[PDB]
Design a protein around this ligand. Sequence first.
Ligand code: IDP
Ligand code: ZN
Lengths: 216, 208
Amino acid sequence: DVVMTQTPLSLPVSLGDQASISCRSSQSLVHSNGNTYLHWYLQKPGQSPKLLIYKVSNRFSGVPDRFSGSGSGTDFTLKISRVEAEDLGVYFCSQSTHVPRTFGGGTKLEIKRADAAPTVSIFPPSSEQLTSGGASVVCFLNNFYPKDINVKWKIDGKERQNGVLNSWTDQNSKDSTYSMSSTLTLTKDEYERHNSYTCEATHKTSTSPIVKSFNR
Amino acid sequence: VQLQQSGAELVKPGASVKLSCKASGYTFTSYWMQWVKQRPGQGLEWIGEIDPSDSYTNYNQKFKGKATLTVDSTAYMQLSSLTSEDSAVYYCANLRGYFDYWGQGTTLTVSSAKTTPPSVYPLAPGTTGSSVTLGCLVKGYFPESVTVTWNSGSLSSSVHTFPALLQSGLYTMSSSVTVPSSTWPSQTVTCSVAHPASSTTVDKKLEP
Ligand SMILES: O=c1[nH]cnc2c1ncn2[C@@H]1O[C@H](COP(=O)(O)OP(=O)(O)O)[C@@H](O)[C@H]1O
Ligand SMILES: [Zn+2]
């Protein structure tokens, strides 16, 4: 069918600056009836897409003039004049000149903000889980920036590679920071053989690794 | 104008399922009802359309014998011979220029695995700081959809909810909330976990 291409696939921009998302069609989007049906949607995590600009430059209801769409034939540009913290998400260009209607892959808007060291919290397994025979020890590394971080688990000084799960949230729209959780799962037996559990993170805002441990 | 769909559906491979789209706030018999599919790794594929006033329909080639639209004021899309590839979010939408409305989307999980309720465990620190972070661990459930709220969702400013992960054959996620040190444990915080698929609603009080 007609293939839409978006440039770039990810775009880091400072609050207050302008952003330009490109979309290109394999074919001309000019319909025989004269119109060019190229649209732009903004999709926020866990949300259905919402239309920003239809037919190249017309704004949907309530959309601010920060957003402007332009282009012609096969070349189209979506511009945001004042990137705002809650503008982050994935921008899709779609076309309905040709059947079937098709969409681009999406461009992820990422906000560039100042460095922030993560806050680390470590939690011992609860009595209720220990009771069931399992033991997950958790570590939350909240509100940091940039997203590049390394987490390491240590049991009585010995590094633990296996049995650990990591999950990170996407950039937070409120403060443009990231978060992550690292969970080390053990049996109630393994957990009870050792004393101190350490959660250690290395981030560029540190130089010296952030450490948080509880002795049992 | 609101287009409401079912939140989720679990079906075994080889089976067939009917997803509804109840239209409200306008004249169904006007705008064509569209269906779009989106799989986690963002990329939307168009499926087809149906004219409520005719029942005239238009399908995308790739979904020729997969989808089968009908209307009634609701609109239905029925799929067939479900495979793992069919596990996606299915939206119904009215896409007519300035008249653009999408439903919430129905998450369709094609799997043989049986529904399993989650085990919720509290994460209380084992102190310190001007504010303390607390959390809940939702462990071993299926299918995916679980919602964690704090103080019935009234405590929402410092919450971080982390994405589910497959641990064993079940899902696992955690959620954190940061409150002022002086307020805990003087005031209690509770995390509520709702697993619709298993008709589960568990509350957990966070005690030291
Ligand atoms: O998304 C679309 N793709 C292709 N044709 C469309 C689309 N939307 C409208 N048309 C059709 O082409 C026509 C032009 O009307 P349109 O709805 O574009 O607004 P306009 O008349 O204000 O320019 C109508 O016949 C209409 O049914
Ligand atoms: Zn040891």
